[PDB]
Design a protein around this ligand. Structure first.
Ligand SMILES: [Cu+]
Length: 77
């Protein structure tokens, strides 16, 4: 059973950006589903996390618009 995280990407006005980001999220060597939301500001992913930093996947956002996208994470570490 997997760790489902949400990253809330307040990036641009469209937030279309999320799926551009999902392409990175859904390519990592530890993930079983990609589940983003663009009209909103959401990127959701099924993957391996807890005793390893979930903030890993945040770098997908940070690499397309560093210092810009207000991405907020559901985590506990
Ligand atoms: Cu956008």
């Amino acid at each position: 059973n997997d760790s489902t995280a949400t990253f809330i990407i307040d990036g641009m006005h469209c937030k279309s950006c999320v799926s551009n980001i999902e392409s990175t999220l859904s390519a990592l060597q530890y993930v079983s589903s990609i589940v983003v939301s663009l009209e909103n500001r959401s990127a959701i992913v099924v993957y391996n996390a807890s005793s390893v930093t979930p903030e890993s996947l945040r770098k997908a956002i940070e690499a397309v618009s560093p210092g810009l996208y207000r991405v907020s994470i559901t985590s506990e570490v």
